[PDB]
Every structure is written in structure tokens, then in C-alpha cells.
Amino acid sequence: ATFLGLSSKQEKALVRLDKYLNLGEIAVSLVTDSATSIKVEGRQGYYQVSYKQPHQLYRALALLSAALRSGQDEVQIEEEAAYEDLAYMADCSRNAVLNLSSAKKMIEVLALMGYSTFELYMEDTYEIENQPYFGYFRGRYTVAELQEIEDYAADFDMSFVPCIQTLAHLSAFVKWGIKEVQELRDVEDILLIGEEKVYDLIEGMFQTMAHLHTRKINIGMDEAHLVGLGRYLIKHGFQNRSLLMCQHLERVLDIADKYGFNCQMWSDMFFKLMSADGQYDRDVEIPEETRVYLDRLKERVTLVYWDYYQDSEEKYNRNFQNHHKISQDIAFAGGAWKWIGFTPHNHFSRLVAIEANKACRKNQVKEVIVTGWGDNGGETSQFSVLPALQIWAELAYRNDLKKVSEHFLVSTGLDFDDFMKIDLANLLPDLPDNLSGINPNRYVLYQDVLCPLLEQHIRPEKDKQHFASSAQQLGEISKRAGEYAYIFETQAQLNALLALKISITSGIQKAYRNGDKEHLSALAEKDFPQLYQMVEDFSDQFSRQWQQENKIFGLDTIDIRFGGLLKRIKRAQERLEQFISGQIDCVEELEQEILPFNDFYKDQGLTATTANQWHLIATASTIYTT
Amino acid sequence: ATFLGLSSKQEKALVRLDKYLNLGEIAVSLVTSIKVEGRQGYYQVSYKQPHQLYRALALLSAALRSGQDEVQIEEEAAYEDLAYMADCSRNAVLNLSSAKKMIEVLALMGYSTFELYMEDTYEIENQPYFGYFRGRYTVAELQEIEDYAADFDMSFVPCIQTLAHLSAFVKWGIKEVQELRDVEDILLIGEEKVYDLIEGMFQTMAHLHTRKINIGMDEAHLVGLGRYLIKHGFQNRSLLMCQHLERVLDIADKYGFNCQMWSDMFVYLDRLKERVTLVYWDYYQDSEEKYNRNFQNHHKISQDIAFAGGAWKWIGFTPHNHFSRLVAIEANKACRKNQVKEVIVTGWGDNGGETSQFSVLPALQIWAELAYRNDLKKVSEHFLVSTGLDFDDFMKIDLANLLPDLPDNLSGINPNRYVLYQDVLCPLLEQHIRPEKDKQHFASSAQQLGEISKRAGEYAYIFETQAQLNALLALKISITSGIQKAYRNGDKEHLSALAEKDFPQLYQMVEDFSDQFSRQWQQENKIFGLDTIDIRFGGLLKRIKRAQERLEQFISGQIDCVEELEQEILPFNDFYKDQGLTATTANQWHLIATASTIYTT
């Protein structure tokens, strides 16, 4: 293609995106018109493109590419985005730290989808002068690495916004038994409000980020549940904790002002500290003294309402109404579900996005942040939720999903419906589709064999057959997934592994109860070696995926988890062999009645459940406690 | 031997103890706490308390084995009750066979009382999640253990928890469990369903004969600050403790129990103190005067104060009888000076129960000698009766903690555990390891323990575990420190040699150690809880493999650097920085093994 009206900056960006766009022998004219977010119009080899915000050039060009690729000659496209800013936030604090090559790839894809902003969530995973323990052995980013990521986003006229922590969610830092670290603590994962050494630390954080061009930052402050109740209480006695939050907020904003920064924060603590049962989804009455303090501070910070779960527009609406009693400046954070094990939930992400979009439009939201959390070890691929990201982009620009396939093809090179099958290890038959967090991908994998804590939540025949069928389907998809084949290979192997693991685990329970030693012997001699090899092979494929996407640091926890499971499979074989041979008269583990693991979904009546903490899936014994 | 003046119960006990006592062709007649007097194959023995018959016979046995014919021994014991408490809540639940063996040994040393510490490890009617998959004791099992103690006229005292230290119960995501919670590991004071649970605890224990019990109540640091705070506002937490204690004491009275409690969380108190014995617990102080100051403070509020000392077996795989001796000598002085009636020697198992249940027999003999004689002059002679082997040999079980040049008065220094579990590529404890000095010590210790194991009879298995552990630590230091050095000087040839020769050897030694440990565990404990140690060992194995793979990719030119090895290694902690020490204390597996997140969300 040839172009009129490009800058040298835009030429350079187009060279990098040519591999996605492949525009052919056409002529494209960029015009100045800023009437709508995007316009594309033409026929017979001549097309005119215009954009409102500079970054919007790259979605406009993706739309042209997609129309032409679909076989259209006449093109007439006009879009008006509902949101001034649309961001993706990757988690870099849950053990997986995105490597530079992968950040750059993500940035390119986001540019084509239409996102204005790339964000990284960093609790302790950046360097601070004279803080050697902050990020120690975690793969913390150097200033030079943050600048390289920022600058690459800036080449596409995209913003960069660090998401850090200035109160809680600092467990990886506060664990160090060094007096200069321990003096910074209140309780659990929370820093000590009012301690000058804590404000020294926080100013260090801003000194690091001041080396960037960006002056927009998310300062955190979510989920500080016991704030004011630890060393704070021992030093100062019991205080008004809503006021305490405001005091700390104002200290942090004054530091931010010194370095020229404008701030956003997670909103949940205001609601939790002022509601009678301590919950977020609550209409709260605010004490006048707190009212007055907040009213002053809401001029100087943007509150972010985060919600990844509700299935209806009105449920979001109630929360926006609650928030608007405090401030007009409310941003929204939705969820691209990739924090429930090894397998994402793009389907569920789609369901809630449709409803959250409706609410955000009804409540005049200017900014939406799509979050990509990695809870409890970062086990899901960094690229697992591309479909959910295209979904939010389509909702933001068109208010519908009618073109999601057409456009996705340009962003990834593969079919949207194929890619959605990445979810299969969570899509059990008959599950009601409005229930969140149902993650058998993870808990079927990590549960023990001798003492299977999740067994009452498994339908042995029904679920096994689903996993086996899903393995088949993913094997064929990976053949046509191109640069993404590796992530589909990972899911194909996981599904095959889960099928065999159910077959063996459930077979043992049945055979032991019936006294069928012949069956137990068949399992021990043939099926156990097969399961063990399939686990080792899965560990190898997963390490492949991890090292493609992430820094090496953090892989160590997954090695511990997989190594433990392997040693437990060997134990199960050994115990059964001793029972079959008569060396022991019973297997006490197999004589225990298995109970429901939890009752979270008892009253929705279903068999599967949510279980998302490895150390609680893997054993009923103590493991981290004294 | 021939016995006169014994009850049928006592005759059955002598029959069971002949294998320890070996009294041979003599007559013993039952006529101060203990007296033995006779000569020429006839001896008279007497006791104050029935259980003291068994120590008296041990004293006679030792006198005879030393070559005496005429024997004249008198002892006056300083303490009315002397107890040993084994931990059954840290993953290792003592099995019935081992409980019986331990009771026999305790009887011969002079202990009046056997105790088991059970947070969630017993059954309660209609509480299916309480001890679920933990190896909880049935009522029948507890009755059998108590009964075996009663055969030697020893008491049984369960040590339970009625406030905190219930982490393994409260983790269950079930409405009927979660509604019992305040915060962290603490039950909700003031909740009727919590008092329903506590009454269930007493209904179980009332199936026993004993009516003495330790109700716990230690280390509830955030009590009143969780769900309690939301429901009630901010209250006087001293007063909350009193309120909870009164409810528990009322339940105990209904079933006829007398209570003890740990004293650490401490008009109201003054009426409650009449109804409960306070236990001052201290495992650490190196001078009599430090204990005395604490007794004095305790005497401000009550004169009914028991003392709990420590037999150090909660710092990994290897105990510290040497340190236990140093502190027992001083504690004994203070307990006598302060007129204490009851001493409990505690045998905790912090963070997984990795140390043998029989690891601290020397510490237990030491406390018995101090209680009966006020000195250690006969420790070896009496220990030989109790165990069949030499006291100085058994004390070498400590070796994986006795690094050269360590000051003897500093507690918890546990390189047995943290040299084992630290990573190879990312060795978090490396700055606390002296690579030649410590390595030589571990190698020498493995050889010493190999020889001792050959003459340890029925305890050989526990010395074999320690011999393998010490040998493993020597090699692991050689490789781990060798990798740091060779990566630094760019010596790929040396990295090749380690990868091809030393790494396979290290992996085999860990597998073999896991096998030996498992034999030990199954001899002593129920099967439940071994799973956590399989998880820890398996994780180490997988990290040894990763280290070999990463080095091989560097040696073969596949990767240009190994980022792990480029990180400056910092001190792990500063606990003993003021003492100028290189070694330290590190007693949490999950913090030793990785700098990554592993239990947090």
C-alpha cells in the first residue's frame, strides 16, 4: 500500500504492524477530520482514513485490513467510542513478570484493537534506590526496562500507567526479617500508616517512576482489611479508620504532587470501612467528618470501581450510584479472566462485559481498565485472553460484537471461535453460565490421589468424557494457531491429563471400597506410570510457555508444585502396591469419608465448585503455618 | 528376679520392664521420694508416689550394672508432678505403639504424667471437618493411650485449644465452620456456636478417666479485632479474655474437669485465678535470674504457677539436646527457688513435625535427674537403663546443628533444616554458610553417626536418618557454593563436571534420604501428614533438576547467561547480626525454599 499524510513517527509504527495488516496494492489517505473516533471510506483501491486520537490510527487501519480481508471492496465504516481511555493491565506481581519481547507484542495487538493505554501491576517488582530487599529475586524491572516498555507504547501514541501499591498487597516485600523492613509494617501485608520510614519508601517509589515520561499512576490501596489494627494500634490506640485512610491518602498525594504525578486508586476500602458488615457492594452513610475530608480529596484522585462478576446491568448501576454520592470522577475496572489456574474464561468474560458496558455507558464513565490478574502463582498464559480483550474493544467502539470475528483475525491471525476454545478445561457440561470462578482445570490437576479433597465435586464419567473430547478438539486447533500454537498445545495436554487423572483417582475409590485388588493392581502397574509421564511432559510444555512469555524468576514456585504432585503420585503407587502384596492390611487414606470441599455453590445446586489456593487443594495438613 | 509386696498391677509392670532393668537373680521387697537399700542379692525399695517405683528400680539397676553389691540411695524430688508433652498437631500424630514405648521410658526416668498437644487432632460428634484427613484420634485410641499410662500409675493430660492455634480447622470453607471465626487462627469470643463446639471438645474428653486438662489460650495476638470488632466495636481485650475464660471454665465444671492454661496473653482476673493453674512457659533464658524476674511478675497475680520448659525438637530434622541441657540447669535453679510444684517439658514440632518423636530422650533424662537429684552426676548411668545406650553417643544426634565456633547460649540456630531446603540456583541462606568450615563439620558428623548407628539397637533408625542428612548437607554445600564460584570466574568446565557427576549424586541422596525419613515417620506416626513432607521433598527434587537443566543450557551455548546466578545474594535475616554470627535461625519452609509467592493470592 501507499500512503499520503503520514508522519515519520506513523511510518515507523506501520512498518512494525505490516505483518498483521498486509494491506495490498491500495492507496490510503490520512485526513485531518476529527468528527468521529474512526472513519474509513472508499472503493476500487482508494481509501480515506481519519481518527480523533492519534493512537486510533492503528484500529482504523486494522478495520480496513479486516474489511478487505473479508472480501469487501466498498468500505463504509464510522465508529464513535464511548470511552476516552481504554486500558489493559497485566499482572506482574503474581510470579509471572512479562519479558520485554512479550510486552512489545502485547502493545502491538492492543494498538490494533484500539486500546489507548498499557498498564503493569507491580507490587514489589521494580527497583528502588537503597531498597535491596524490594523485589529481591523476583525479576524486578530495572528503570531501563520500564523506559523501553514505555517508549515502545509511546511509538504507537499509547500511554503507560504503572499500577503500584502504597498500602497493602506487599507480602513479597514485608516477609524479609531485616530490621529496616520490619519497621515498615502494620500487620499481615499492610504498611504502617504515619511512619516516616514508610513515607521515605513511598517517595522512593515515586523517584523511580519519575524517570519515566508518564505522570499518571495507580497508587493501589485495595484490600487493606486490618489497616490500623496491628503495630499501628500498639503505637496509637484505636482510631477512626476511615479518617486514617484519608490521612494516608493525603500524605501519598503530596508526595505524588512533588514529582508531578496525577493519581488513581482502587475504591473498595471506603465502602468496606463504612458499611455495617464490611462489604464493597453497599450503599453507605458517610460520617460528616469523613464526608468533608473525602469531598476535598476527590478533587485530587480518580476512584476506580472494580467489578469482574455481576451478570446484569442494574447490579453495576447500584454501585455507580453509590460511588457518585462521593465523586463524579469514577473510572471502571472490568475483568479478563485469567487468574483461575492454567486455563482462562473468555466465555464468562464476554457475559459480564456485555452488561458492564451497558452500565458504564449509563453512568458516563470516561475510562475503562480491563484487568488481567494472575492470582496465586501466575499459571495462565499472558496471551490467554486476547478474545476477551477484542470483546471489550468492540463494545467500546461499536456497542456490539457483530464484527468481533472479522477484526480478531487481523489482531491474531486466527479464528475467534477457535481461540475461545482455549477455555475448554473450565467449560464442564451443564454448568450455569452466569457463575464465576468455576475452575476444575486447576483443582482436578492439583488434588491429591490418595486423599482427593475435591472428589465430591467431580462427576467421574461426565467430566472425564468432556476433558477427553476437549483434548481432541484442542489438538486440531493447535495445528492452525500459528504463532500461538504453543498455548493450545498446553491446553490439549492439560485436558488429556485431567481425563486420565479422574479415571485413576475415581477408580481407586471404587475398587478399594469393593475390595477389588485385581483392579488396583492393573492401575498401579499400567495407569500410574502413564499418569506420571504425562505430568512430567506437562511440566516441560508449561516451562516452554513460561519462558516464552516471562522472566525466569517465579517459575520456581510452579516447579515446587509440580514436584510435590509427582512425589505424591509415587506415594499413591507405593501404598497401593503394599496393600496388594499384603505388606499392609489397609490403606487408611482410602478409609476416610470424603466431604464437600466447600459450600460456595451448594445452593445453586451444582457439583463443580471454585477452589483457587494451591496449598488448600493439595493437602489437608499444615504447610505454611507454624 | 523375685518380687515381694507388689500389687497385681505392679507385677504386670515389672514383667514389661524386665527388658530394661535386667535385675537377674535378686530379691526386691517393697516397704523420701525414693529409697533403695540392701546388699548380697536382697534390696528394699520404697516410694512416695506409686509411679516412682519405676525410677527406684532404674536406680537399683544402674547401681548393679556399675558393679555395686551394697546399694544405699535416697532421693527427694523437688516437684510433685513432672510431665512430658509431645506435639500431635504439627502433622506428626504419635501412633499407639510409639506412645506405649515412650510411656515405658518416661516411667523409668521418673515422670508422673504424659501429655499430648491436640489442636484439631481428636474427634468431636457432629463436627466432621474437625481433624478431617489429619489422623485425628478416636475416643478409643485416646482411652488406650491413657490406659497404658495408668498401668504405670502415670496420669494423662490432654493439651487442647479453646481460642487460637486452630488454623487446620478454620480453613474449611463451610458455613458452619466459617461462622465460628474471629480472624486468622482465632475463634469468635461471644458466639454461642463456638461454645457449642467447646462443649463438644469436653464431651469427647469426658470419655477419658482423667479430669485434668490444659485448655490452651496462648498466642491469640489479634483477638477481638476481626469479625468480633465488626459485631461489637472496640472492647477491652484483657476483659474479653476473662469473659471467654469464664465460659470455658463453666463448661469444664459441668463435666468435672480442673484446668491449666498458658499464661502469655496476660478484679475479674483475681476471681478467675482461683479456678485455673497458670503455666509460665520459657524455653530460652540462660540465667536463673532471668527466670526469677518472670516468676515474680507471675506472683503478682497468682501463687498457683506451673513451669513449662523445653526439649528442643521443633527446629527441623535435628534436635538440640545440648541447648536443652544448658537452659534446664538454670530453669531448675529458678523453679526450686520459687517453690514450683509442677514442671512440664514440652516437645513441640513447629512447621511440619520433621524431628523424630524419640530425638530428645537425653533432654528428658536431664530434666528427670535435675528434678530428683539436683545434679547430672548420674545422667549416663540412669540413661543406660532407660534406652540401653550411651548418653554421650545419643547426644551426638544433635550434630547437624553443632557448627564449630557457635556460642552455646544462642537458641534456634538450625542449619540442619535451612541448608537442606534452600534452593540451588537461588540460595537464599548462602551468606550464612561457611563453605569449607561447615562442609567439613557435616562430613565428619556423618562418619561419627554412621559408627554410632551400628551400636544403637532399636534406635538405630534415627541415627541412620541423621547420618544421611549430614552427608547430604556436605555435598549440597559443595555444589551450591561451587556453582557460585565457577559461574563468577567463567569456569564452564567445572560447571560441566558438577552437572554430569555431582548433580545426579545429589538427587539420588535426596531420594534415599526421603526413603529413610519415610521409614522413620511410619515407625513413629500415623500416615496422615507425611504428605506435606512428600510435597517439600518433591519440590526440592524438581528444583535440583531445574538447576542441572539451566546449567546445561549455559554450558551448551543455548543461553548466554543464567540470570539467577547474576543476582547479588543478601543476608537472609539480621536476627544474630549483633552477635557477629555467620549462621542464623530460619524455621519456615516456605520462606527458606523460595523468594516467590507460594501460599498468598
Q: Where are the domains of chain B?
A: 1-76, 77-376, 377-601
Question: Are the beta carbons of B601 and A612 separated by less than 8 Å?
Answer: yes
Residue listed under C-alpha cell 569449607: B436
Spell out a b/e string for A418-442, using b for 16 or more CB atoms within 10 Å of the CB, else e. bbbbbbbbbbbeebeeebbbbbbbb
Residue of B425, B540, B598 to mutate when probing chain A, most A C-beta within 10 A:
B598
Contact (Cβ atoms closer than 8 angstroms) between residue A61 and residue A50: no
Question: Are the beta carbons of B599 and A623 separated by less than 8 Å?
Answer: yes
Q: Domain B377-601: which CATH class?
A: mainly alpha
Distance CA A23, CA B170 (A): 61
Q: Where do breaks (C to N over 2.5 Å) occur in chain A, by preceding residue number?
A: none
Listed as own residue / partner, the contacts of B171-174 with beta carbons closer than 8 Å and 24 or more positions apart are B171/A616, B172/A598, B172/B129, B172/B132, B173/A597, B173/A598, B173/A599, B173/A600, B174/A596, B174/A598, B174/A599, B174/B129
Residues 329 through 348 of chain B touching chain A, CB cutoff 8 Å: none
A-chain residue closest to B226, CA distance = A226
Structure-block grid coordinates of residue B306:
506451673
Declared resolution, Å:
1.6
Residue of A558, A559, A565 to mutate when probing chain B, most B C-beta within 10 A:
A559
Question: Are the beta carbons of A592 and B230 separated by less than 8 Å?
Answer: no
Q: How many CA atoms lie within 13 A of A150 on its CB side?
A: 19
DSSP structure string for B423-438: -SSS-TTGGG--TTHH
Nearest CB to B591; choose among A175, A277, A450: A175
Kindly give, in sequence order, each residue whose CB lies less than 8 Å from that of residue A363, ignoring residues fewer than 6 positions away.
A316, A317, A320, A321, A324, A330
> Nearest C-alpha of chain A: how many angstroms from B492?
21
Measured in whole angstroms, the distance separating CA B168 from the mean position of its chain's CA atoms is 19
Contact (Cβ atoms closer than 8 angstroms) between residue B370 and residue B329: yes
Contact (Cβ atoms closer than 8 angstroms) between residue A49 and residue A39: yes
Contact (Cβ atoms closer than 8 angstroms) between residue B47 and residue B36: no
A-chain residue closest to B424, CA distance = A556
Select from A568, A494, A499, A487 the least CA-distant residue to A538.
A494
Select from A266, A48, A137 the least CA-distant residue to A553.
A137
Q: What is the DSSP letter of B365?
A: H
Question: Are the beta carbons of A588 and B528 separated by less than 8 Å?
Answer: yes
Give B586: exposed, middle or buried? Use CB within 10 Å, 0-12, 13-18, 19+: buried
**Fold exhibited by the domain A402-626:** Four Helix Bundle (Hemerythrin (Met), subunit A) (1.20.120)
Structure-block grid coordinates of residue B342:
509442677
Residues 346 through 385 of chain A touching chain B, CB cutoff 8 Å: 375-377
Select from B237, B241, B218 the least CA-distant residue to B229.
B237
> Nearest C-alpha of chain B: how many angstroms from A259?
30
Amino acid identity, residue A255? I
Ranges of H-type helices in B225-373: 227-232, 237-255, 268-272, 288-301, 321-337, 361-373
Give B296: exposed, middle or buried? Use CB within 10 Å, 0-12, 13-18, 19+: exposed
Query: How many Å is the Cα radius of gyration of chain A?
Result: 26
Angle between helices A100-113 and A404-412 (to 10 degrees): 150
Query: How many Å is the Cα radius of gyration of chain B?
Result: 26
Superfamily of domain A1-80: N-acetyl-beta-d-glucosaminidase (3.30.160.230)
Q: How many residues does chain B have?
A: 601
Contact (Cβ atoms closer than 8 angstroms) between residue B110 and residue B154: no
Contact (Cβ atoms closer than 8 angstroms) between residue A561 and residue A614: yes
User: What is the DSSP pairing of strand A38-43 with strand A46-51?
Assistant: antiparallel
CA angle A168, A172, A175 (to 5 degrees): 95
Domain B77-376 matching CATH 1.10.3720.10: the answer reads no
A-chain residue closest to B578, CA distance = A179
Kindly give, in sequence order, each residue whose CB lies less than 8 Å from that of residue A529, ignoring residues fewer than 6 positions away.
none
> Nearest C-alpha of chain B: how many angstroms from A306?
17
Q: How many CA atoms lie within 13 A of B248 on its CB side?
A: 29
Q: Is B593 helix (H, G, I), strand (E, B) or coil?
A: helix
Residues 146 through 205 of chain B touching chain A, CB cutoff 8 Å: 167-168, 171-175, 183, 185
Distance CA A56, CA A77 (A): 14
Contact (Cβ atoms closer than 8 angstroms) between residue A247 and residue A193: yes
User: What is the DSSP pairing of strand B34-39 with strand B71-75?
Assistant: antiparallel
Listed as own residue / partner, the contacts of A281-284 with beta carbons closer than 8 Å and 24 or more positions apart are A281/A318, A281/A319, A282/A322, A283/A318, A283/A321, A283/A322, A284/A322
Contact (Cβ atoms closer than 8 angstroms) between residue A241 and residue A197: no
Is the fold of B1-76 the same as that of B77-376?
A: no
Kindly give, in sequence order, each residue whose CB lies less than 8 Å from that of residue B90, ignoring residues fewer than 6 positions away.
A622, B314, B348, B349, B350, B351, B352, B353
Residues 69 through 98 of chain B touching chain A, CB cutoff 8 Å: 90-91
Contacts of A566 in chain B (CB under 8 A): 538, 541-542
Question: Are the beta carbons of A622 and B185 separated by less than 8 Å?
Answer: no
Q: How many CA atoms lie within 13 A of A419 on its CB side?
A: 24
Q: Does any CB of chain A come closer than 8 Å to the CB of residue B15?
A: no
Superfamily of domain A81-401: Glycosidases (3.20.20.80)
Cα of first residue to Cα of last residue in chain A, in angstroms, is 67
User: What is the DSSP pairing of strand B186-187 with strand B181-183?
Assistant: antiparallel
Contacts of A173 in chain B (CB under 8 A): none
Question: Are the beta carbons of A557 and B597 separated by less than 8 Å?
Answer: yes
A-chain residue closest to B541, CA distance = A563
Distance CA A605, CA B12 (A): 60
Question: Are the beta carbons of A560 and B574 separated by less than 8 Å?
Answer: no
Distance CA A583, CA A435 (A): 47
Distance CA B326, CA A388 (A): 65
Question: Is the dihedral angle over the CA atoms A387, A389, A390, A391 positive or is it negative?
Answer: positive
CB pairs under 8 A between A and B: 193
Please report, for residues A18, A40, A140, A265, B344, the alpha-carbon distance to residue A410 in angstroms, rounded to integers and kept in the order given: 11, 16, 33, 34, 74
Select from A434, A439, A353 the least CA-distant residue to A395.
A353
Q: Domain B1-76: which CATH class?
A: alpha beta
Nearest CB to A179; choose among B229, B536, B574: B574
Contacts of B540 in chain A (CB under 8 A): 563
Residues 110 through 139 of chain B touching chain A, CB cutoff 8 Å: 128-129, 132-135
What kind and span of H or E run contains B13?
helix B8-21
Contact (Cβ atoms closer than 8 angstroms) between residue B421 and residue B540: yes
Structure-block grid coordinates of residue A155:
511509538
Sheet strands side by side (includes B27-30): B2-4, B27-30, B42-47, B34-39, B71-75
Residue of A94, A121, A137, A455 to mutate when probing chain B, most B C-beta within 10 A:
A137
Nearest CB to B596; choose among A132, A554, A615: A554
CA angle B333, B335, B341 (to 5 degrees): 140
A-chain residue closest to B577, CA distance = A178
Angle between helices A8-21 and A56-70 (to 10 degrees): 30
Q: How was this structure determined?
A: X-ray
Contacts of A132 in chain B (CB under 8 A): 568, 570
